[PDB]
Amino acid sequence: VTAKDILGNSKYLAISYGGYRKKSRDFQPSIEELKEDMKILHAMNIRILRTYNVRLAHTSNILKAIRELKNEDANFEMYMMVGAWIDCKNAWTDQPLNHHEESENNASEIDRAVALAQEFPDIVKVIAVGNEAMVKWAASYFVQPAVILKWVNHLQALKKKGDLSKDLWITSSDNFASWGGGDPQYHVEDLTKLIEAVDYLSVHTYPMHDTHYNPIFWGVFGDETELSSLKRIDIAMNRAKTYAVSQSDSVASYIKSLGINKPIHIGETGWASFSNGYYGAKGSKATDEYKEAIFYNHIREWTNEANMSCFYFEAFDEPWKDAHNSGGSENHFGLFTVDGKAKYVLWDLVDKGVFEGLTRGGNPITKTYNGNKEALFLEVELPPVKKEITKNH
Amino acid sequence: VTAKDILGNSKYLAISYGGYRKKSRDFQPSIEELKEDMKILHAMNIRILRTYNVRLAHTSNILKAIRELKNEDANFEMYMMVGAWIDCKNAWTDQPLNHHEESENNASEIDRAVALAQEFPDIVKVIAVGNEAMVKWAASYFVQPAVILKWVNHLQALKKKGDLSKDLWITSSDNFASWGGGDPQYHVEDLTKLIEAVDYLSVHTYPMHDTHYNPIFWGVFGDETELSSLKRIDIAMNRAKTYAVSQSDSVASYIKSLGINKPIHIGETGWASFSNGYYGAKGSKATDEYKEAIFYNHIREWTNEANMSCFYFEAFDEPWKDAHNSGGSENHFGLFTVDGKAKYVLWDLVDKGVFEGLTRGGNPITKTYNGNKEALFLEVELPPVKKEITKNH
Amino acid sequence: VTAKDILGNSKYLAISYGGYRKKSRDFQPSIEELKEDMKILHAMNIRILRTYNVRLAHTSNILKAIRELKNEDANFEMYMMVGAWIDCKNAWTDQPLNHHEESENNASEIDRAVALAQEFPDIVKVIAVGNEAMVKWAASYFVQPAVILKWVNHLQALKKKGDLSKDLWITSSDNFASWGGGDPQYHVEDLTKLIEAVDYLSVHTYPMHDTHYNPIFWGVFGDETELSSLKRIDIAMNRAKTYAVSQSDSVASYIKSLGINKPIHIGETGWASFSNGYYGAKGSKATDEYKEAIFYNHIREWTNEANMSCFYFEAFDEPWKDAHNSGGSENHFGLFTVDGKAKYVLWDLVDKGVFEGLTRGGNPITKTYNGNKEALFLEVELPPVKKEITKNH
Ligand SMILES: [Ca+2]
Known part of the structure; x- marks a missing residue:
């Protein structure tokens, strides 16, 4: 029934969701198309999804879609974390940006x-x-x-005065560093007040990206060369998981240092299945369906044992995100393909029949690579070999 | 019994052989060590081997080893193609080379x-x-x-005079181009006489090397990108086989143009399982155990259907060949590792029990990767993608 | 009008032609589409075209199209150089190529x-x-x-016997080196006989390609750096023209040395307007519409003063030639774009009204860049600066 009951409860698995199927968000998916997605996610045991703005029709249409499905079927259950997008002054215009002032349009987005x-x-x-x-x-x-504090407070005040349910939870979804878990430049009075005002902290962490931007944790190191290729990937991917855990924990340490006790949930993390830039064959060797599956499962195990929701990024590939470059990693964060094929991570569920009778855009839910693990493994590369310096500890 | 009976007969499979186990040929393998190798090769249906010089003790010791094994076991059968190494003047000294004069040491090598x-x-x-x-x-x-003509004629004269058996076959083992199948610069009178003088032509062809030095045949081309990873490798490797066939056939065409009928056999070809230079991950993506197996089997099928011997390069990895760089492809042409592990190409034979009871340097004949095909496939890369121009044919 | 009257006569300008509009030749253009092209070329003073094979329907359909237009209009005049495509054994199959044997399919192509x-x-x-x-x-x-000699002789024999007109000219269209103007490896008896058997020599020369493969002529050299940009391009492009002239003249010198007098015509040369490989911004800086225009005009001036036809490559961009890479230079050799836009080279003719009333695929003949020379010049790059060594002459 309530956010307090849902978040951190593994009977209500979370996901980040977008239902766009084309290279521009100008092509809004229809309510019928969104219902297709909802049925697929529901079949998988997803019970809460996350959304990013309320400017375009998309979020509103998802709610309409869920409502229709709940009228058709009294046991259908899907909940939503609604994103209100916040901009600084002149964002998305050709005028000079000012990061110390707010967009005049934030008010109506909150409304x-x-x-x-x-x-x-x-x-x-x-x-x-x-x-x-x-x-x-x-x-x-x-x-x-x-x-952010201004609008979180506005929303908490609407709850106090009775215009919103007292059980509705308010947060901001942001990078670990924004929540105080990184550079101390962020450690300002206004952040402390924001940490007080929210009902919980929605924290993002992205090891996949850091395989390029901060690669100290990523590789095959020393003696690991002598291990099996399977084991090398397992060990390397475990370091990626632990890296995320550290970043989340760093936020927890920060809040404890302020004498504040709030729940922390993972609002965004993910590992793309393809990249033609920094993260694939031409860079860090991170992106493919096998390493995505390993990361997804590690993140699920960690979050379910720690009683955190994880709004994993993302349900379906969304090819509008790097519109002019289809091989860009932004377009490949799905557990499913744009056409509704299940990537390696979900092959097991296709075999159990979980998606039988379900369709996306006319297509049944099929395994990528025809379910051929060998064909996948040929395309997978190993992480780069690195040498470790031993400290005199 | 005779070379005429053996060559081109698939009951007598050929191989190129060296038994050196260390990074220098100064460490001659013992007769006991060579017998280990002979037993392994014999178990595999190898019945003729090839050797490169008679200056070091190695070739002489192989003959001693084979003799001991034939005394122990009357059904043991191994034959030899003995290489007499030929040099130009001042080869392997610090004096000026002269490629139009011969080394004074050739005579005693032929003796x-x-x-x-x-x-x-x-x-x-x-x-x-x-x-x-x-x-x-x-x-x-x-x-x-x-x-070469001079010494071939010397050996043919010793046969005629009765110092050598009339059934002993004389050849020279050389690149396809040296035998007239490539640049016509080679098409000189002395080559025509050499082709007349030999009993047959021992021809080398190396597609693996040409994946770097002449790469027009090597890659994944056009529409092939849409095919399965398995199929992409199969197609690319088939082009490699066909390339070798073309080079061998080019020699057959050249001798036919001279009005000469001689048998042709493949004296050397091979595909290394590893490279840290031009042929592996840092270059053409040719070298790994899977592609080696594909090449080996294609060469066996082609040669057995064409009634050619193929002295395939090589039985065992020999780490003296690129002594100062163990990752060099020269050290990885074996069907077995230096320690006696069977590479992917021979896994099937290990499972049938062909090498049971046999040992190299104390080790039983084990599968590489623990016989785990998945682990191999992770390490295998695909050939590079290339531009296909369509001609208006 | 006979080939002798047409070739080398500037009242009958030649061009290389294909009418394919899609990324595969499986999509044959219709007779109606081909007539569109013929009208456009005829308006430009093109009176003879060249074609590459008679296997696909394309060449046959061009002839049908020209015939229809001659019936519609008694003053319409278009002639054809028909290409019979010749292959070696196993070309375009997965079987081993043999460049010393011919394809079994040549006979029916000649027929x-x-x-x-x-x-x-x-x-x-x-x-x-x-x-x-x-x-x-x-x-x-x-x-x-x-x-080639075999089939040229076959055709000359059909003319002798009366099955073909005695005024029909026979040739082979080939690179300058194949006709004896380069590496003397080509200087064989069969070539001399071929030079005797043909009515003329159709010679190809491609400076554009050599801006990468043999770049000694291509650049801005020494003192030229101090000159105007306009002038740096003119000088560099003049070297490209003179390079082609030298290659053509080298063929003329070779036939003179054999005591044979035959006409030489340029069967193929061209300069692409775009490249994303070796010839554009990422390589030699050759490809753009300005340098194409300069080259086209230089080749026209040279050929008309020397009384040579130039079957210039090519009338229209043909995007099937590098099907999987639309930025490949093979797709950009047209004077017109696939959509019927006139590139810089023909802007002047659009302004004079030469293409008024004419259409390709529904589009009128428009200038590329909206006829804005400044917009073109921003995209054009200068040739690379090179080292000039002064010899002691
Ligand atoms: Ca030469």
Whole structure:
């Protein structure tokens, strides 16, 4: 029934979701198309999904779709974490950006989020104020924590005064460093107040990206060369998992140091199945369906043992994200392909019949590579070999 | 019994052999060590082997080893193609090379070859005058065809006079181009006389090397990108086989144009299982145990259907060949590892029990990768993708 | 009008032609589509075209199209050089190539070429036996000159016997080196006989390609750096023209040395307007519409002053030639784009109204870049700067 009951409870697995099927978000998916996705995710035991803005129709249409499916079937159950997108002044225009001022359009985006939580209170269990909106590298739109605090407080006040349910949880979904787990430049009074104001912290961590941008944890190191190729991948991927755990834990340590006790949940993490830039064959050798599956399963095990939700990125490949370059890793974060093929990670579920009778865009849910593990393994590369310096410890 | 009976007869499979186990040929293998190898090869249906010089003790010791095994077991059968190494003047010294004069040491090398054919006429069926000794790129030692002709004619004269068996076959083992199948620069009078003088032509062809030095045949081309990874390798490797066939056939065409009918046999070809230079991960993606197996089997099928012997390169990895770089492809041409592990190509024979009871240096004959095909496939890379131009044919 | 009247006569400008509009030749253009092209070329003063094979329907359909247009308009005039494609044994199969034997399919290709010259003797003025079929780098299909000679002689015998007009000219269209103007490896008896058997020599020369493969002529050298950009391009492009002239003249010198007098015509040369490989921004800086125009005009001036035809490559961009890579230079040799836009070279003619009322695939003949020379010039790069050594002459 409530966010407190759902989050951290492995009977309600979370996922990040977008239902766009073409190279532009101008092509909005229809309610019928979104219902296809909902049925597929529901069959997999996904019970809560996450969304990014309320400016385009997409989020509103997902709620309509879920409502229709709940009317068709009284046992159908899907919940939503609704994202209200937050911008700095002049974001997405040709005018000079100001990261110390807010977009005049944040107010109406918060208003539209509120309206949706009110029309669909049986589905909407969380509002997230911003998506990576405080991280200092989000050059196109980032804001100061004072702006997120402002809107989180606005939402907490609407709950106090009775315009929103007292059980509706408010958060902001952001990088670990924005929540205080990294550079101490972020450790400002406004962040402390924000950590007080939210009901929980939605934290993002991305080892896959750091296989390029901070690669110290990524490789085959020393004696590992003498191990089996299978074992080398297992060990390397385990380091990737532990790296994420460290970043999450760093946020927990920060909040403990402020004398604040709040739940932490993973709002975003993922590992793409293909890259023609930094993360694939021409760079760090991270991206393929096998390593994606390993990462997904490690993240599930960790989060279910720690009682954290993980809104894993992402349900379906979304080819609008790097529109002019289809091989870009942004287009390959799905557990399924755009056409509804199940990647290695979900082959086991296809075999058990979990998606029987279900369709995406006319296609049945088929295994990628025709379920041929050997054909996948030929395409998989090993992580790069590195040498380790021994410290005199 | 005779070379004419053995060559081109698939009941007598050929191989190129060296028994050195260390990074220098100064460490001669013992007779006991060589017997280990002979037993292994014999178990595999190898019945004739090839050797490169008679200067070091190695070839003489192999003959001693085979003799001991034939005394122990009346059904043991192994034959030898003995290589007499030919040099140009000042080869392997610090004096100026002269490729139009011969080394003074050739004479005694030919004498030693003759002495061995005489002491072991039941084993030695062929003498080869030179190994790639005419090919113009063998900068360290190459000679003109007049010098090979000279020694071939010397050996044919010893046969005529009765000092050697009339059934002993004489050849020279050389690159396809040296035998007239390539640049017409080679098409000189002395080569025509050499082709007349030999009993047969021992021809080398190396697609693996040409994956770097002449790569037009090597890759995944056009529409092939849409095929399965398994199929892509099969197609690419088939082009490699066909390339070798074309080079061998080019020699057959050249001798036919001279009005000469001689048998042709493959004296050398091979595909290494590892390379840290041009042929592996840092270059053409040719070298691994899977592609080696594909090449070996294709060469066996082709040669057995064409009634050619193939002295396939090579039985065992020999780590002295690129002594200062163990990852060099020269050290990885074996069907077995230096420690006696059977590479992918022979896994099937290990499972049938062909090598049971047999040992190399104390080790039983084990499968590489623990016989785990998946582990191998992770290490295998695909050939590079290439541009296909369509001609208006 | 006879081949003798047409070739070398600037009242009958020549061009290489294909009418394919899609990325595969499986999509044959219709007779209606081909008529569109013929009208466009005719408006430009093109009076003879060249074709590459008579296996696919394309060449036959061009003849049908020209015939229809001659029936519609008694002043319409278009002639054809018909290419009979010649292959070596196993070309375009997965079997081993043999460049010393011929394809079993050559005979019927020659038969189909003779049938077309017979059904359309008012249009077909030349048969060309082969297209680059002797050049030793055409690895996929090349043949020995004996094979071309065989079929040229066959055709000359059909003319003698009266099955073909005595005024029909026979040739082979090939690289300057194949005709004896380069490596003397080509200087064999069968070539001399071929030079005697043909009515003329159709010679190909490609400076554009040599800006990568033999770049000694290509660049901005020494003092030229101080010159205007406009002038640096003019000087460099003049060297490209003179390079082609030298290659053509080298063929003329070779036939003179044999005491043979035959006309020489340029069967193929061209300069692509775009390249994403060796010839554009990522390599030699050759390819753009400005340098193409300069080359085209230089080749026209040279050929018209020397009384040579130039079957310039090519009328329209043909995107099937490098099907899997649309930025490949093979797809950009047109004077027009696939959509019927006139590249820089023909802007002047669009302005004079030469193509008024004419259409390709529904589109009028428009200028590329909207006829904005400045917009073109921004995209054009200068040739690379090179080291000039002064000799002591
Ligand atoms: Ca030469």
